[PDB]
Scaffold this active site. Structure first.
Site, short mmCIF file in Angstrom:
data_model
loop_
_atom_site.label_atom_id
_atom_site.label_comp_id
_atom_site.label_asym_id
_atom_site.label_seq_id
_atom_site.Cartn_x
_atom_site.Cartn_y
_atom_site.Cartn_z
N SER A 124 0.85 -1.18 0.00
CA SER A 124 0.00 0.00 0.00
C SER A 124 0.89 1.23 0.00
O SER A 124 1.83 1.32 0.80
CB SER A 124 -0.93 0.01 1.22
OG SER A 124 -1.65 1.22 1.29
N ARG A 125 0.61 2.17 -0.90
CA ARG A 125 1.44 3.36 -1.01
C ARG A 125 1.06 4.45 -0.03
O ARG A 125 1.79 5.44 0.08
CB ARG A 125 1.39 3.90 -2.44
CG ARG A 125 2.30 3.17 -3.40
CD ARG A 125 2.19 3.72 -4.80
NE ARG A 125 2.07 2.65 -5.78
CZ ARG A 125 3.07 2.18 -6.51
NH1 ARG A 125 4.29 2.65 -6.41
NH2 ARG A 125 2.82 1.20 -7.38
N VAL A 126 -0.06 4.31 0.68
CA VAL A 126 -0.41 5.24 1.74
C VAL A 126 0.21 4.83 3.06
O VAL A 126 0.78 5.65 3.77
CB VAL A 126 -1.94 5.36 1.84
CG1 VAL A 126 -2.32 6.34 2.93
CG2 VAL A 126 -2.52 5.80 0.51
#
Ligand SMILES: Nc1ncnc2c1ncn2[C@@H]1O[C@H](COP(=O)(O)OP(=O)(O)OP(=O)(O)O)[C@@H](O)[C@H]1O
Ligand SMILES: Nc1ncnc2c1ncn2[C@@H]1O[C@H](COP(=O)(O)OP(=O)(O)O)[C@@H](O)[C@H]1O
Ligand SMILES: Nc1ncnc2c1ncn2[C@@H]1O[C@H](COP(=O)(O)OP(=O)(O)O)[C@@H](O)[C@H]1O
Ligand SMILES: [Mg+2]
Ligand SMILES: [Mg+2]
Lengths: 468, 46, 339, 511, 464, 50
Positions: free
Chosen positions: F26-28
């Site tokens: 996940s890039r968040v």
């Protein structure tokens, strides 16, 4: 003297002008979309002369709502962007419009985004290490001040995290100007970078030019040129050191190839445009330092489908001084940054520049990792017991070395929840010299995972029940 | 040594170019007049 | 030694910048000087005279492009047949023949299938002759019968070639009647002036060139707007109206200049599109014609197109070969020649 | 310097002449289609306004397709195009030594004009099959691996093929640097003039290569033809032919030339771009049907001329970049077929410390021993079999107890020889030094030395001889063979040095 | 009635002719390049009739300097090469022009290079063996008279010496002649071959036809047909047995692919020309035995990516009758010719063709050599001591057999002054039968180097 | 902004959901989690990759 739209097919528009009024190539033309919901002013860049007074243009904005036969006006010049110290601390798009303060900079000096690269006689090779504090980068891919640095890798391997880390490590204390070009990347990442720069107080010294992946192909083609024009002004006029961050430069080539067949060009290998190398060469050759004028550029290069043989990254490789190549395999091991130490390279990693000890330790690390790579398959099938004694010792050393090349980065704190670390180059060299000699073979390999220097190693070994 | 020589060379080069610009300005007219005279296949006294 | 290299490099790059600048301002000032000097008419005349002398000392040399061997030969045979048959035709008879040929060409253009059938090459032309006489004998004259039979009997690459051949025969008949009236030079000048003015105003030319709109409206437009004037030769007016009436896939100015080229070639001369910043003296014109004829052997019909942007001098283009004496061209060469 | 421009203006003059003209009917992406010019030749050089140059490649009844060689953005529909009545040609002469020029022979180093002895067309035919003689003279690269395992003769075409960052440019630059002593000799039969063609490299890389050549004094006899990445596809396509033309002017005057093409894959890409933009039929990998012809006609101009034509020669060192070490790709396949031998460089060998990373197992030189001197032929005779047996036996490295004496000796000798062929960058070795080092390796004089010390030992011993026993090198160089007396003296010197030498682990290397 | 150039795109030239003067397909046309530097006479081969009196042709020389509208002369026939005994000893290009003596042979009889294979009736239903006289070739990989032989071997393996040996044997034993076809020939190697054949004094028995690397694809495509036409004249008209060498046949295939791409044809699988099989068959079917005379062909074959399923080798091997691999290992041992008796093979090594005795002897030799090769690794690693007694006996017998496959070749005389030998097939069969049975294992190994039949073996044993 | 790679191999061998941890990301990151989850699962993905 005005032209009219003849054909509209996606981002490519054919425009017919009266005889003798045909605009020059790369001129900016203006057309009006009057439909209320999508009303706007299209900027079209003349791409080709088709003969009989027709020009084929690439639209910078979506052409939905455009109508055949509408008046097209020629600005008489290429796309131009504001230049000067004023652009610092502000966010622009490929067309030069300020996003945070619309209307800002309209009165500044404007420079055309199309420019010839510096003359060959003005080019001087750069050989001076740019210490970052990242063990792997400083040991095996030393960065060059005033040189060209690239971060290669496939999707989601840590290119952007590493770009942000390098911003933190280099631009945070840079004495010159920074230009960040977001070429065809996520808008969320652009907003995050804007907020982060504002918080770090680095924004005051940075000019941001954004063309996102939702923009049409023309904007993604020209945003890099716009940001590069700002950087070129800072290099040639202000006479101060410049930091140029580009993410992602592959998007320039991809956008070029998106319109190649609509422009009438027969496709080349792997679906790319026939002019891939030439357009890339022009753009890249503009991104250089000249004698006495420094541009330290750092580019993120996306490797399509992890295929490093793909023509885009393969063509890009020739334009770089240092290349940190991120690997999906290293990523899937949890090693971060996911650098492939056997595939990365630096032009200044030689005894003459970095020194005998640095070069020796780097070569020994690379040799050990190469031998481990060779032995991986044997260990997987026949097991480690069937290796020779020296091979077992080397395998243990190599596993510890690959773990130790991992590091906790500041930009990664949002992911690991662990604060980052900075390792001086001398400490890195000493630590890896000790590793290659087996001075840490008694520590569990887990002690080497995502730490900083030898002090962090001692702490983690204590936490795991070991002691150096 | 080469760094110091290069920086002093740069500053003195800027000075020399600056003082040469004026000397060029006072003599460009004759060069342009000769050019325009010989381009037309007949001398222009101007 | 390499430090010496570096300092010498900086010195030489400063030298290069100096040279480039000096040259830029030098060429700009030279352009200003020449433009100032060429304002007076005497400078213009002297430049023209010296360039004419240069042409005189020049040594001689040796040397419808769209059509090909079959079509060109067939059209040559057709024009020879016309010269043989219509030579004795009267001026009014010539006008009637031209009108009939134009009507036939319009019919062929509108009726595509009949054009295909009449134009498809065939070794035996007897069926072609039979159909042509069956369909046309009702509304054409015997001389028209003969001309159409000759045209259809010969070969053409495509139907458009046959249409062009018919139109060319009609135009050449109109030119024949023009020379019969003895106003060949008048129609030449009128056609060239019409072509020039039509090129000047591309909007009207493009409006006329739209063959989608019915040709009657466009020919009426030409008659009332341009072709209807006091000093307009009636023969040239008719020729231009016919040309615009048959326009299709062609731009009006191109058609008019082609008309003028054909009209001049009717006498065997070659048109030389001379360009200069001012009109020349009659003696100058005669000298120019004589020298150009000597250079190209065949007599040349010099056509003067005034254009002050040449800053004096002459530019003579004929048969894709150009002798450029324009002072503006010389200035451009001097500028690009700078180191 | 005002006098400089004053001289040009006072000398500048133009004269009207009957000229054949065309008009640009369309233009895009570096190509321009121009109508008219009925008498234009194929490959004729055309001039567009503003001093823009093009090459007429594609002639049909409608128009001429022209490749624009630069500043294509100045091309515009309706512009007047003039023919020059000349095919592509470049100036040639001795004045091009030490200069950097573009594929038109125009200096780009900012050192003034170049005095051209004459002009040479880029497409002059190669020497015929009867204008040549056998390649029989060594071209010493100074690299032990090449000079022993894949020797290069004068007039040969030796491909240097490998993945990126394997040392191809390093090998070529080392060869050029090695020519320094031959240059200083002053004898044209020994001198080698060097042409380095850079295609598609960034300008700073070319500047680095020039800097390296300056350091070694190689630019006194080296010419660089540069078509950097920013150049038009026309320059990238033409640069090898420009360098070849300069080299040929020297070759036909009895001189010996070494030409490096770095690299021909980028030239092939530029030619493919031009061909695709001209709508020519594409084949495998979208290359035109005559890319093989491109490289073959380029590389057949490297030849060893007969004595009737002065006996000059031009040696070609084309460089090819493979991807994932796939030598069966289209352009690698073609160039491998064309050339006389191949030096395959591999990343795995490079990372193992084997530098230069030449894979001696697959590297070949069809000229072979004919391109070596007698001494090198003697000492290098056993290297092939020794290394092949070593690679056969390396799987038994940890089992030397289980190996009979012969096999263990073979393994140890192979390790010694592998260390022997290693060479530092920018350090060409003279042929006599190479002979002595290979003699050390192949005569069992490294058996008593630890493997990890071999290199140092070698180097030190070579420095010892050159300091005290240079008569051995003299003998070898002048006679080109290792005499019995010289061999005995060398053995005694080696043994005394071994007495003096000390291993890294401290153990003696004596006996 | 002369045509004119209308379009030029690299080697492809479009020419327009009057209505009644359109040349037939494959006719040779002559244009002129008059530009001084590049002046030449350009040969074009009609490839397609585009209609509208236009023909598309392939230029046999570079078109650089050619102008639109220049005259093009139809010669009325396809590319014709000179034939007769006069072509022996001289070097020609694909167009028949003599290279070692320009203008030579211009008065000879000229034959079109496009000919059909012998009629179905004229072919010989029975495959016949070509007794070369070499022990290894005759025994293990017998050659088919009128068939095709693939040759594989790196550098320094005696490939050129083997070619000279075969030239010698065809010239002397069969009273025949040789034609060498260098397809995609390297100019340096062509010059080397010319000089070497002159030095070996076998050039008089050979006709060399070179289509070089640096010529447009058309000449490289047609050179094989030119050489084959010379060979066909020698066979059918002179009534000789010819030996035709082709190096490299794969380059003929690749030039065909390049020409097909230049003409706009869509590539077939793996990018080869759609008619790859048709072209290879048209070339290969002309090499055969007809009316008591044969053309035998030895062809160097390149295998792309070592992939024998690649379309080019896959099509070529559809016509190959035997395979001969030259090994670095065998050559290093001093065994000449350095044939690899295990990797090499022949399609007619069957009892139905060569008889049961020959088949049995050859099979026994192959078995012994294969077992010895299996034991080679043990010998290398642990030494011969670890071998069993039966293993040691077999190793000695196999060493003697593998050394008796060597022979003193005719072409090797100029290197080692000794003249060559010609072992009769029956003599070789019986000698190797005895060797396999174990009737010479007492003799020393050195006695088996480079000798002929059993008489020479006895003499060399006595001399030791 | 990241991906969940589902693999049939993991699904068949009982790992359901068949998320391939090594490549899924996940890039968040921690911003998309509550503080407690971020606290107890900071290094979970890296731990399972290793
Ligand atoms: N013999 C050597 N010993 C040590 N380092 C070497 C040697 N040869 C080359 N190198 C280094 O290897 C790296 C690659 O060298 P080089 O650029 O010459 O190779 P290349 O294959 O031409 O590369 P590229 O793909 O960048 O053009 C450089 O750092 C060079 O210094
Ligand atoms: N140093 C790191 N430590 C932990 N996780 C990381 C690190 N770098 C990247 N990641 C994970 O991998 C993802 C991909 O990183 P990012 O650079 O945004 O993608 P890309 O490499 O495609 O630009 C991140 O969102 C993060 O979850
Ligand atoms: N029967 C033989 N006797 C002596 N020398 C030989 C023999 N066969 C081959 N050689 C040597 O081996 C080398 C083989 O080279 P060449 O004839 O060019 O074949 P290739 O093309 O396989 O290298 C020759 O130089 C030759 O001296
Ligand atoms: Mg990213
Ligand atoms: Mg390189």
């Amino acid at each position: 003297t005005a032209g009219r739209v003849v054909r509209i097919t996606g981002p490519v528009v054919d425009v017919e002008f009266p005889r003798g009024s045909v605009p020059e190539l790369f001129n900016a033309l203006h057309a009006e979309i009057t439909f209320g919901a999508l009303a706007k002013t299209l900027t079209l860049e003349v791409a080709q002369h088709l003969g009989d007074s027709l020009v084929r243009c690439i639209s910078m904005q979506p052409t939905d709502g455009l109508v055949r036969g509408v008046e097209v006006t020629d600005t008489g010049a290429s796309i131009s962007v504001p230049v000067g110290d004023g652009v610092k601390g502000h966010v622009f798009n490929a067309l030069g419009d300020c996003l945070d303060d619309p209307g800002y900079g309209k009165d500044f000096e404007h420079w055309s985004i199309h420019r010839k690269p510096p003359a060959f006689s003005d080019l001087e090779p750069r050989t001076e290490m740019l210490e970052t504090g990242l063990k792997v980068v400083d040991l095996l891919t030393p960065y060059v001040r005033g040189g060209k640095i690239a971060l290669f890798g496939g999707a989601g391997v840590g290119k952007t995290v590493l770009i942000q880390e390098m911003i933190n490590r280099i631009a945070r204390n840079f004495g010159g100007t920074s230009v960040f070009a977001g070429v065809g990347e996520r808008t969320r990442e652009g907003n995050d970078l804007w907020v982060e720069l504002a918080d770090a107080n680095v924004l005051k010294d940075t000019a941001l030019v954004f063309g996102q992946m939702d923009e049409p192909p023309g904007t993604r083609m020209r945003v890099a040129l716009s940001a590069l024009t700002m950087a070129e002004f800072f290099r040639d006029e202000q006479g101060q050191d410049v930091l140029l961050f580009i993410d992602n430069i592959f998007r320039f080539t991809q956008a070029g190839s998106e319109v190649s067949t609509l422009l009438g060009r027969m496709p080349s290998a792997v679906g790319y445009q026939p002019t891939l190398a030439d357009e890339m060469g022009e753009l890249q050759e503009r991104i250089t330092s000249t004698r006495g004028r420094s541009i330290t550029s750092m580019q993120a290069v996306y490797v399509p489908a992890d295929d490093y043989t793909d023509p885009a990254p393969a063509t890009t490789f020739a334009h770089l001084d240092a290349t940190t190549e991120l690997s999906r395999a290293v990523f899937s091991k949890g090693i971060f940054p996911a650098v492939d130490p056997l595939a990365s390279s630096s032009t200044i990693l030689d005894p003459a520049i970095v020194g005998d000890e640095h070069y020796r330790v780097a070569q020994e690390v690379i040799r050990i990792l190469q031998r481990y790579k060779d032995l991986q398959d044997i260990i997987a099938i026949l097991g480690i017991d069937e290796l020779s004694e020296e091979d077992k010792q080397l395998v243990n050393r190599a596993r510890r070395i690959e773990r130790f090349l991992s590091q906790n980065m500041m930009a990664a704190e949002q992911f690991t929840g662990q604060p980052g670390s900075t390792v001086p180059l001398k400490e890195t060299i000493e630590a890896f010299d000790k590793l290659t000699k087996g001075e840490f073979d008694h520590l569990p390999e887990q002690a080497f995972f995502l730490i900083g220097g030898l002090d962090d190693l001692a702490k983690k070994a204590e936490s795991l029940g070991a002691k150096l | 040594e080469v760094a110091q020589t290069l920086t002093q060379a740069d500053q003195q080069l800027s000075a020399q170019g600056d003082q040469v610009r004026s000397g060029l300005e006072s003599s460009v007219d004759g060069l342009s007049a000769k050019l325009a005279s010989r381009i037309l296949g007949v001398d222009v006294n101007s | 030694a390499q430090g010496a290299q570096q300092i010498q490099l900086m010195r030489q790059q400063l030298i290069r910048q100096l040279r480039t600048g000096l040259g830029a301002e030098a060429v700009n000032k030279a352009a200003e000087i020449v433009r100032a000097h060429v304002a007076d008419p005497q400078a213009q005349s002297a430049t023209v005279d010296r360039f004419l002398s240069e042409l005189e000392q020049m040594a001689p040399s040796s040397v419808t492009s769209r059509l090909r061997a079959a079509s060109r030969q067939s059209l040559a045979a057709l024009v020879e047949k016309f010269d043989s048959v219509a030579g004795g035709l009267d001026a009014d008879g010539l006008t009637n023949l031209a009108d009939e040929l134009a009507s036939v060409a319009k019919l062929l253009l509108s009726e595509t299938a009949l054009n295909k059938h009449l134009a498809e090459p065939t070794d035996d032309s007897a069926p072609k002759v039979r159909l042509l006489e069956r369909l046309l004998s009702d509304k054409v004259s015997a001389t028209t019968l003969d001309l159409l039979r000759t045209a259809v009997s010969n070969r053409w690459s495509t139907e458009s070639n046959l249409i062009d051949a018919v139109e060319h025969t009609a135009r050449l008949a109109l030119l024949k009647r023009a020379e019969i009236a003895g106003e060949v030079d008048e129609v030449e000048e009128q056609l060239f002036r019409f072509g020039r003015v039509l090129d000047a105003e591309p909007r009207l030319s493009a409006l006329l060139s739209d063959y989608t709109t019915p040709a009657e409206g466009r020919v009426a437009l030409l008659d009332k707007a341009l072709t209807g004037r006091p000093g307009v030769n009636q023969t040239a007016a008719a020729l231009l109206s016919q040309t615009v009436g048959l326009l299709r896939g062609e731009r009006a100015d191109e058609a008019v200049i082609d008309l003028a080229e054909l009209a001049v070639s009717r006498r065997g001369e070659v048109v030389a599109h001379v360009s200069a910043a001012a009109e020349l003296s009659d003696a100058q014109r005669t000298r120019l014609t004589e020298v150009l004829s000597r250079i190209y052997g065949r007599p040349v019909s010099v056509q003067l197109h005034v254009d002050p942007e040449l800053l004096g001098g002459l530019s003579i283009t004929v048969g894709d070969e150009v002798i450029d004496g324009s002072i503006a061209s010389r200035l451009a060469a001097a500028q690009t020649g700078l180191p | 310097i005002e006098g400089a421009i004053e001289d040009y203006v006072s000398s500048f003059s133009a004269d009207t002449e009957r000229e054949e003209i065309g008009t640009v009917i369309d233009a895009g992406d570096g190509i321009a289609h121009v109508e008219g010019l009925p008498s234009v030749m194929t490959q004729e050089l055309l001039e567009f306004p503003g001093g823009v140059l093009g090459v007429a490649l594609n002639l049909d009844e409608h128009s001429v397709g022209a490749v624009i060689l630069g500043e294509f953005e100045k091309i515009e529909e309706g512009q007047q195009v003039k023919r020059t009545g000349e095919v592509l040609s470049v100036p040639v002469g001795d004045a091009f030594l030490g200069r950097v020029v573009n594929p038109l022979g125009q200096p780009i180093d900012g050192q003034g004009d170049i005095a051209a002895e004459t002009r040479r067309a880029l497409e002059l035919q190669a020497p015929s099959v009867v204008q040549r003689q056998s390649v029989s003279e060594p071209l010493q690269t100074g690299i032990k691996a090449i000079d022993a395992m894949t020797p290069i003769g004068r007039g040969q075409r030796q491909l240097i093929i490998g993945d990126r960052k394997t040392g191809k440019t390093a090998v070529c630059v080392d060869t050029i640097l090695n020519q320094r002593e031959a240059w200083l000799t002053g004898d044209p039969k020994q001198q080698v003039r060097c042409v380095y063609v850079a295609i598609g490299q960034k300008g700073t890389t070319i500047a680095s290569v020039k800097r390296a050549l300056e350091e070694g004094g190689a630019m006194e006899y080296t010419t660089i033809v540069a078509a950097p990445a920013s150049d038009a596809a026309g320059f990238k396509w033409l640069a090898p032919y420009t360098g070849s033309a300069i080299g040929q002017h020297w070759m036909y005057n009895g001189k010996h030339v070494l030409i490096v093409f770095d690299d021909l894959s980028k030239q092939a890409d530029a030619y493919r771009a031009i061909s695709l933009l001209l709508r020519r039929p594409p084949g495998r990998e979208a290359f035109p049907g005559d890319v093989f012809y491109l490289h073959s006609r380029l590389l057949e101009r490297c030849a060893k001329l007969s004595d009737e034509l002065g006996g000059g020669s031009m040696t070609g060192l084309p460089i090819i970049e493979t991807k994932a070490n796939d030598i069966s790709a289209f352009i690698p396949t073609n160039v491998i077929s064309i050339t006389d031998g191949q030096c395959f460089l591999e990343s795995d060998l490079f990372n193992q410390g084997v530098r230069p990373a030449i894979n001696v197992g697959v590297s070949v030189s069809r000229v072979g021993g004919a391109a070596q001197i007698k001494a090198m032929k003697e000492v290098a005779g056993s290297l092939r079999l020794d290394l092949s047996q070593y690679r056969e036996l390396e799987a038994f490295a940890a089992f030397a107890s289980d190996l009979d004496a012969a096999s263990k000796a073979q393994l140890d000798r192979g390790a010694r020889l592998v260390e022997l062929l290693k060479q530092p960058q920018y350090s060409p070795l003279a042929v006599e030094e190479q002979v002595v080092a290979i003699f050390l390796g192949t005569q069992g004089h490294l058996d008593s030395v630890p493997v990890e010390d071999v290199q140092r030992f070698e180097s030190e011993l070579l420095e010892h001889v050159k300091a005290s026993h240079s008569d051995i090198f003299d003998g070898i160089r002048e006679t080109k063979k290792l005499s019995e007396e010289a061999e005995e003296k060398l053995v005694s010197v080696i043994n005394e040095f071994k007495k003096g030498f000390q291993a890294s682990d401290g153990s003696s290397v004596v006996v």
